Amino acid sequence: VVLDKYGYPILYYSKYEDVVIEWNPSVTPVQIEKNYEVKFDVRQVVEAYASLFKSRLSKLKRILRENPEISNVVDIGKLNYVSGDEEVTIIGLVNSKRETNRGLIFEVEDKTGIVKVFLPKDSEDYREAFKVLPDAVVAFKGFYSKKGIFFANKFYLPDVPLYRKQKPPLEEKVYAILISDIHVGSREFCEKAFLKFLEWLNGHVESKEEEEIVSRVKYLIIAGDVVDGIGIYPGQYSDLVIPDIFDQYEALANLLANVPEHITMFIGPGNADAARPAIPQPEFYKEYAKPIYKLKNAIIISNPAVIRLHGRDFLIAHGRGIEDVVSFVPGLTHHKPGLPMVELLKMRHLAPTFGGKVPIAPDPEDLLVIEEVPDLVQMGHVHVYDAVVYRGVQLVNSATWQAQTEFQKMVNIVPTPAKVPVVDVESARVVKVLDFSGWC
Numbered sequence: 001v002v003l004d005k006y007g008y009p010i011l012y013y014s015k016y017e018d019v020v021i022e023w024n025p026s027v028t029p030v031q032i033e034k035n036y037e038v039k040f041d042v043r044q045v046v047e048a049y050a051s052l053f054k055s056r057l058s059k060l061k062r063i064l065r066e067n068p069e070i071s072n073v074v075d076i077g078k079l080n081y082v083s084g085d086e087e088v089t090i091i092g093l094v095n096s097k098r099e100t101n102r103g104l105i106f107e108v109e110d111k112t113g114i115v116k117v118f119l120p121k122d123s124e125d126y127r128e129a130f131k132v133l134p135d136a137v138v139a140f141k142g143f144y145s146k147k148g149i150f151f152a153n154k155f156y157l158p159d160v161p162l163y164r165k166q167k168p169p170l171e172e173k174v175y176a177i178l179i180s181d182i183h184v185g186s187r188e189f190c191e192k193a194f195l196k197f198l199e200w201l202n203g204h205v206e207s208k209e210e211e212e213i214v215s216r217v218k219y220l221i222i223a224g225d226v227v228d229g230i231g232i233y234p235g236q237y238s239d240l241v242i243p244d245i246f247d248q249y250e251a252l253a254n255l256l257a258n259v260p261e262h263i264t265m266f267i268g269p270g271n272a273d274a275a276r277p278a279i280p281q282p283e284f285y286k287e288y289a290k291p292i293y294k295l296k297n298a299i300i301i302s303n304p305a306v307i308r309l310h311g312r313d314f315l316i317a318h319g320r321g322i323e324d325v326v327s328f329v330p331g332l333t334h335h336k337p338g339l340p341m342v343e344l345l346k347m348r349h350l351a352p353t354f355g356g357k358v359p360i361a362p363d364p365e366d367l368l369v370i371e372e373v374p375d376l377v378q379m380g381h382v383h384v385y386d387a388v389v390y391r392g393v394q395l396v397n398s399a400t401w402q403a404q405t406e407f408q409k410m411v412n413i414v415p416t417p418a419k420v421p422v423v424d425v426e427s428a429r430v431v432k433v434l435d436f437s438g439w440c
């Protein structure tokens with residue numbers, strides 16, 4: 001039985017009040033100038049979705065036009081004023097996508113019209129066109145039939161540039177720790193493993209290599225599902241140790257209060273959090289999440305957000321789009337969220353698909369478009385660790401602190417709890433993975 005305060009689910013144990021972890025005096029932190037900036041945050045800004053699709057198409061059409069190979073772009077509404085002898089390019093939204101034994105049939109839409117696009121079974125770009133999600137913005141080079149079909153010979157994605165200038169080296173080596181899906185309130189929350197991680201952060205390490213990493217750790221990024229929430233799925237009460245949303249954030253803040261003062265924490269919301277029930281999520285609902293807002297070394301970031309650390313762009317998103325990729329693309333699955341994350345980077349959109357459990361807000365501007373090329377992309381949500389480099393961009397899933405729940409077992413989700421990516425800010429790369437799973 002769920003309860004509501006002003007409409008929101010609030011309720012249906014210890015809150016780590018006693019938890020006190022002090023810094024190890026034996027370890028001295030390396031004195032580095034903290035160079036950080038929230039480069040992008042959601043808060044820095046008839047048909048309900050008309051303005052959103054206009055914004056999405058306009059933004060991604062700009063990214064496609066930056067490809068030197070994309071030329072002779074013509075409006076879809078002008079396609080039969082074009083003779084069948086002229087090779088043209090069209091840019092538009094993938095409205096529909098259907099496979100025949102003879103190839104792929106797309107319904108592509110721009111600001112001027114809609115057209116049926118055919119791509120033959122084995123056009124060298126087929127593998128990519130077979131993977132593209134609907135409501136993504138793509139380009140097609142080909143000829144118009146005059147029967148109503150665009151016979152494409154080439155398919156293009158917004159993508160990331162193959163060549164980008166290397167960044168100047170930093171004065172000192174600085175590390176960033178990536179975590180997500182803590183799920184405080186769940187019986188499956190790896191409580192001891194997380195306490196051992198807080199000890200590790202406070203210089204309580206047993207090797208010299210770890211000691212030189214801990215001394216240089218200045219940033220901690222939390223990519224959503226910081227609490228387990230209330231009424232997220234039917235039967236969730238059976239798994240909750242803390243069945244109160246206020247007490248979940250209070251328990252979380254009591255743990256996060258034990259994060260060293262020299263570490264700047266960037267905390268973003270997820271789908272389990274007391275935040276907007278659609279994406280993008282500006283922040284957390286301050287009425288429920290107040291205890292984390294009061295942490296001295298914490299900065300509440302939006303979902304999505306872009307954090308510039310020492311000149312390196314870290315794009316932080318919860319990871320709702322990984323689900324869209326695994327459902328729509330056969331062959332791609334969890335156990336490896338790295339490849340689905342590459343597809344979102346290539347589409348330059350975090351969650352293009354409409355209709356899923358993935359609620360996309362009918363906002364005026366599409367803030368889910370990856371407008372600028374990041375150095376690192378951090379996502380959570382799927383509860384499986386992975387890391388892959390695509391064209392100099394590090395794609396990384398920060399896993400979870402939650403062991404396999406009853407519900408996860410049923411929907412065949414196999415998590416990799418307590419696996420912590422260690423990021424070298426200079427190269428914006430995962431250099432080590434801390435494994436605290438022995439405590440699970």
Ligand SMILES: C[As](C)(=O)[O-]
Pocket residue numbers: 181225271272381382383
């Ligand atoms: C429990 As979940 C799959 O919403 O991180």
Ligand SMILES: [Fe+3]
Pocket residue numbers: 181183224225270272381382383400
């Ligand atoms: Fe989660």
Ligand SMILES: [Zn+2]
Pocket residue numbers: 224225270271272318380381382
């Ligand atoms: Zn989630």
